[PDB]
Amino acid sequence: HMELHAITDDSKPVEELARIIITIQNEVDFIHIRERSKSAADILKLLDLIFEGGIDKRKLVMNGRVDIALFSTIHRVQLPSGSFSPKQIRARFPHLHIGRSVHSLEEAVQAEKEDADYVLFGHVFETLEGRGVSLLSDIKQRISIPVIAIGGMTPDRLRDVKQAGADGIAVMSGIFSSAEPLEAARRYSRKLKEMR
Amino acid sequence: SHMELHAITDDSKPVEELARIIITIQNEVDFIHIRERSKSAADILKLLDLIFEGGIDKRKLVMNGRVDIALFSTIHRVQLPSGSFSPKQIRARFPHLHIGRSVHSLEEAVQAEKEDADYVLFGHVFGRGVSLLSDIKQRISIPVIAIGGMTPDRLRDVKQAGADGIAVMSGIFSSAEPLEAARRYSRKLKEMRYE
Ligand SMILES: Cc1nc(C(=O)O)sc1CCOP(=O)(O)O
């Protein structure tokens, strides 16, 4: 079984983004809130809209803003490269599930040592010096926490990623840039099932 | 009689340049608010490393917005934007922090005091702004730092009206010589205290 993570695209007004989030929630396993260029005031407004729209809070992951996760009762955070260590986070907030975004074998190895719960590895298909799919396989062999692949994920590339050993994939533009995000998300989950 | 001088960073400069400026001005101001709204956590933490290795006094530092960065950097002072966390929330989890709120009307100032802020920044002041500042200073009993168009020639009016301090962004960080800009503000404050 392979997880599907949806990643918001830091491009839409909160009302539109909120609608899309509510619509796709049963087609994906996790939704990462990654609105880098919005203020905390705007992100809290977004969260208020999806909470009152009935979103299942267990599926939400806050990228980067540990403070917003803490004051919104969101229990999963994704930490970018160069930001807080998982050790600092876990020392004071042991209830948090913690992901690390990593871009090399050695950074993946170090994340497991600092007690991350899982890693996001990419950018897999960006033209990492072409080493994306091979490294994915090397990382999976070397660590024992889950590995989620990100960067250029499309339905036609999922077999390669699956064969390399990924425990799931992460998708941004493939869903949130679609004219029909629900259908877009469905293409991914259908392909994932058909590979079974 | 002592009026505080708060310098506010301007979210416009590469971290290396901003670090240099912060170190040169540190003895001329009382507080420096890190307000790099467009930069990531990784970049802000790189800024803090540069100024810590440059020798800065950490007790002068205030984090705007990013309570997580303040906490994991042993900075004890945060400034909370309008529409963000309430001071009550912050104080329940991190009671050792000194907490400021940014407010833009008399009613928002009164509310900030009720929600247990330690002080407010009120702006933008720059006749209508100063009058409102004066009205707030009777309405609440926590300190009020005035912000918005603060220049040396406007400092006497602001002080006479009751401000406990002033906050300055472009008057310092948009200068050719940020240290000499800061000195103009501190010299004028000193004259006023002695006169
Ligand atoms: C959000 C993100 N993180 C990456 C990493 O390597 O950390 S690559 C990426 C963007 C993925 O976008 P899309 O599905 O449109 O390709």
Ligand SMILES: Cc1nc(C(=O)O)sc1CCOP(=O)(O)O
């Ligand atoms: C950061 C900030 N807050 C304001 C408020 O009214 O809340 S005005 C402002 C910028 C003030 O810049 P300068 O000294 O260049 O006039």
